[PDB]
Design a protein around this ligand. Sequence first.
Ligand SMILES: CCCCCCCCCCCCCCC(=O)N[C@@H](CO)C[C@@H](O)c1ccccc1
Length: 236
Amino acid sequence: GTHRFVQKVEEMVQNHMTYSLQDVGGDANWQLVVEEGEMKVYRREVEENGIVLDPLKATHAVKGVTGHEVCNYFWNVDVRNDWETTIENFHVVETLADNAIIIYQTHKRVWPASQRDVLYLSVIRKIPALTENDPETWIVCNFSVDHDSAPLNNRCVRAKINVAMICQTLVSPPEGNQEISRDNILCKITYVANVNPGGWAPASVLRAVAKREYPKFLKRFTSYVQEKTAGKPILF
Ligand SMILES: CCCCCCCCCCCCCCC(=O)N[C@@H](CO)C[C@@H](O)c1ccccc1
C-alpha cells in the first residue's frame, strides 16, 4: 500500500511470522496456564519497573472454518460488538487502506485500577505459501500508534499493545465422490498479545484477569466464527 504506516506494518508482520510462530510448549520461559480442548494459553512472566508486561500466546485448532474467515471476522469492525465483551466504546479514527484502519477504544474496568484506553492500527494481510503443499497464512496485527485526532485522555490510562491473530487452514479432502465440506477443514490459530498496562497494578490480579479473559474471548470468538460460517461456501 501507499499509506504512511506500510513499513511499520511489514516489520510487525515479519516479526510475528518469525518470533510469534515459534513453538512454546517445550520452552521453559513459558508456562501453560490454560488448557481446554484444542485450546492452550501460555504466558511468560515479565515486568519492567514493577509494571506487568507478561507476553501471552494461545494456540487453538477450530474445525469447520478457514484462516481467511477467522481473520476476516477478527478484523471486521462491523461484527466487533457481536463477540467482544471487554470494550466500553470504540470508533474508527482513520481508514488507511482497504485492509488497514486505526481504532480508538476504551475498555471496561477489568483491572483494580483506572480505566484503560488504546489506539491501534489494525491490519489484515495474507502471507503467500512458498509451495502448494503448505498453508497460506492470514494474519491480523493490532499494534499501537499515535494519532492527532486521539490524544491522551484525562480520564484513561493509555495502554500500548502488540497483538497478532495468525491462522492457517489445513484441509483433508474426502476419499471419493464427495465434495469438500466444512467437515474437511481445520483452522490452526496462534494468537499473541503483548499488552503494556501503562501504569502499575497488582500483578497477581492482572495475571488472574488474563487467565480468565483470554480463554473466554478465544472460545466465544471462535464459536462465533463457527456459527456465522456454518453451511456457507468455504472461503479459503
Ligand atoms: C489494552 C487495554 C487493556 C485493558 C484490557 C485488559 C486485558 C483484558 C484481556 C482482553 C482479552 C481479549 C482481547 C481481544 C482482542 O484481541 N481485542 C481486539 C479487538 O477489540 C483489540 C485487541 O487486539 C486487544 C488485545 C488485548 C487487549 C486489548 C485489546
